Amino acid sequence: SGAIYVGNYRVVNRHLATHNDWANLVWEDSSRDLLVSSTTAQGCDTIARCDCQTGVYYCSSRRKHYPVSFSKPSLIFVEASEYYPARYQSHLMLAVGHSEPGDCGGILRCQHGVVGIVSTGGNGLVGFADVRDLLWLDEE
């Protein structure tokens, strides 16, 4: 579990969005596993606008932040689960790091800000949904 709070927006994994997030929907993309909802309170996270490939992510299954090297956002094949059939998820970045079911929503950060959130994983890999191309998160 976990979310990004920037401006008047709440960014979450689409598969973990609540019925309230859908009522307050701003934008969603099933192919990216992302959902953005509106908030009454202003958030304090800053989104990174860079091409960094190294950062630090939060791993809830270990209660630890780990430094990682990660790939550029790409179309990556993800196995079927209770949330989606087998498909390609877009804007996904992979790293060698621990993750287990329950870890989605952990923040990946670099020196410039929030890069993304955990969205996939398995076999000593962890996948992050990139948010650095969503330039509109900085305005209105």
Largest CA distance in the chain: 40
Burial 99-113, CB ≥16 within 10 A → b, else e: beeebbbbbbbbeeb
Chain Cα centroid distance, residue 139: 19
Draw the binding track, 23-42, toward ligand A1BRK (x: CB under 6 A; -: no contact). ----------x---------
- Kindly report the length of the chain: 140
Q: Would you give the DSSP letter of residue 33? A: T
- Binding status of residue 92 toward Zn ion by CB under 5 A: no
44 labelled binding-site residue: no
The listed partner (ligand A1BRK, Zn ion, none) that binds 21, CB under 5 to 8 Å by sort, is none
For the CB of residue 3, give the shortest distance to ligand A1BRK in the complex, in Å.
15
127 with 118: CB under 8 angstroms?
Answer: yes
Q: CA 110 to CA 42: how far, in whole Å?
A: 22
Could you say which residues in the range 23-62 bind Zn ion, by CB under 5 A?
48, 50, 52
Residues found near Zn ion in the complex (CB under 5 A) = 48, 50, 52, 110, 112
Residues found near ligand A1BRK in the complex (CB under 6 A) = 15, 33, 78, 81, 83-84, 89, 99-101, 103-104, 118-122
Question: Binding site for Zn(2+), residues?
Answer: 50, 52, 110, 112
